[PDB]
Structure 1
Amino acid sequence: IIGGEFTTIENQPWFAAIYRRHRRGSVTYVCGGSLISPCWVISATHCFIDYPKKEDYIVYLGRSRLNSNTQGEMKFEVENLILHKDYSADTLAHHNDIALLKIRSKEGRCAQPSRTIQTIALPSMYNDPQFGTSCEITGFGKEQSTDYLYPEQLKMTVVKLISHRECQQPHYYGSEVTTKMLCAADPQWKTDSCQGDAGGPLVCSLQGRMTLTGIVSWGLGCALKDKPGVYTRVSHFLPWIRSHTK
């Protein structure tokens, strides 16, 4: 997250932190995700497509810090890693960038709701907020595009939704953006998602309900003029989600 503010997991208690194991004691951060039911985390296919084996990943819930443990966190292996079979990528835009992780602890359990572990509601189909609406994003990604390190403490920011008509202009993203994607950005381009934020939640309040409107997907750079963050549009994937979480 460029700009924005530090947070703890209480303020985004569906946020999942996803890590990869290595041949070497290297266990390293991969991407964010969102808890949509006790046994399911939703995230972006691009986070996993190079290494698509479920045993390579660990998922934490209840965690506010990147490389240190948070009191009350839970640790899960990945029982099933489900990628969207229509996934595609070019240099930039990822299509159908949506993934599900079925989570299971060493003891064979799913997430147990607490003050730090909660689910987020899915949108109703084709039901997104109007352009201009302020929503929130959350993640451990870079704070500056030139940084090498990721922040140790979770961050959040606010971005406003951009219409497909605005985002498809040539001086924004042209044909790279489809109606299965949502653009979002700050009026001054001063705050944004960045590398290491993929897979995390774009949350909007829709009729009183905190809603998973989007999943962090791609962008050109971070916090660049006329180059919004791009998000998988969750409300266009409900049948995919309904089927695969069985």
Structure 2
Amino acid sequence: IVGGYTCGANTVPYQVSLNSGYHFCGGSLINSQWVVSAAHCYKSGIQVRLGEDNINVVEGNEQFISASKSIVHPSYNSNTLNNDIMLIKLKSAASLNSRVASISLPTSCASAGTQCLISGWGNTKSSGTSYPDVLKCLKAPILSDSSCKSAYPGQITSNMFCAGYLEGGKDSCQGDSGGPVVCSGKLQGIVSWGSGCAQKNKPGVYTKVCNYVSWIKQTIASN
């Protein structure tokens, strides 16, 4: 996250770190056995780390649970990042408490101008590189579809939305991928893509979660 703030330990209790020997992507806990992330975060050998603040120190509220299964969306296109969403099932159920909690799925899509909370352990620099040890947070608004499409002509589908600041300086970034965009208490986005990070006229592009709720519910009901 570029231009963000230190969240505060376990203030974002649905935030997970995906670990394959190192932190590589974020995700969101949607019930005791399921995590939502980005399909472009796919890899084998995922361990899901819940209750994290400092990803490099064991502080005492973590739960480390191996994935039993990953399910990339059936229509994921890695070239366009259309349908950039994946479900991860945990080998055992997480213990839900004040530090480890699930986030609601939307029933209705989010509106332009809504301020959302984006979080992760991604790069904090735009140009140059610095990864944090503790969870960073960013408040960002949803941008109009017309502005989003103007920023990325010929690249935005109806399964994407833009959030952030056209002036630049505040954005999610590499390493934040897969993590949450929460608006009015609902998981409405997944950190997906963007041209660089925090660049002028290049906002972040997010997977539009509300278009996938049917698929998420059906998949969880069958696996």
Match of 1:133 in 2: 114
State which of 182, 199, 204 in structure 1 corresponds to 2:161: 182
One-letter amino acid of the counterpart of residue 213, structure 1: Q
Which structure 2 residue ranges, 5 or more long, are not aligned? none
State which of 164, 167, 179 in structure 1 corresponds to 2:148: 167
Is residue 14–residue 34 contact of structure 1 (8 Å, CA) maintained in 2?
yes
2:66 aligned with 1:72, yes or no?
no
> How far, CA to CA, are the matches of 1:81 and 1:245 in structure 2?
12
1:187 CA displacement: 5.2
1:143-184 Cα shifts (integer Å, max 9, x gaps): 003344411111001111012122112xx0012111111110
Per the normalisation by structure 2, the TM-score is: 0.95
> How many percent of aligned residue pairs carry the same amino acid?
38
Match of 1:23 in 2: none
Is residue 158–residue 186 contact of structure 1 (8 Å, CA) maintained in 2?
no
Match of 2:87 in 1: 100
- SS of the residue corresponding to residue 142 of structure 2 reads strand
Per the normalisation by structure 1, the TM-score is: 0.86
> How far, CA to CA, are the matches of 2:143 and 2:73 in structure 1?
25
> How far, CA to CA, are the matches of 1:212 and 1:222 in structure 2?
22
- SS of the residue corresponding to residue 168 of structure 1 reads helix
Which structure 1 residue ranges, 5 or more long, are not aligned? 21-26
> How far, CA to CA, are the matches of 1:115 and 1:43 in structure 2?
22
- SS of the residue corresponding to residue 223 of structure 1 reads coil
Is residue 14–residue 102 contact of structure 2 (8 Å, CA) maintained in 1?
yes
2:34 aligned with 1:34, yes or no?
no
2:206 aligned with 1:217, yes or no?
no
State which of 170, 193, 217 in structure 2 corresponds to 1:242: 217
> How far, CA to CA, are the matches of 2:111 and 2:70 in structure 1?
33
State which of 39, 57, 66 in structure 2 corresponds to 1:45: 39
Is residue 9–residue 15 contact of structure 1 (8 Å, CA) maintained in 2?
no
> How far, CA to CA, are the matches of 1:220 and 1:188 in structure 2?
14
- SS of the residue corresponding to residue 64 of structure 2 reads strand
> How far, CA to CA, are the matches of 2:9 and 2:218 in structure 1?
29
> How far, CA to CA, are the matches of 1:10 and 1:137 in structure 2?
14
1:70 CA displacement: 2.8
- SS of the residue corresponding to residue 101 of structure 1 reads strand
Is residue 166–residue 203 contact of structure 2 (8 Å, CA) maintained in 1?
no
Of stretches 184-193 and 74-83 in structure 1, the one that deviates more from structure 2 is: 184-193
Is residue 62–residue 70 contact of structure 1 (8 Å, CA) maintained in 2?
no
2:36 aligned with 1:57, yes or no?
no
1:176-227 Cα shifts (integer Å, max 9, x gaps): 111111110125322100010000000001xxxx110101000001111111
1:12 CA displacement: 0.6
> How far, CA to CA, are the matches of 1:224 and 1:187 in structure 2?
8
RMSD across aligned positions (CA): 1.3
1:4 CA displacement: 1.0
- What count of residue pairs does the alignment treat as equivalent? 221
2:122 aligned with 1:150, yes or no?
no
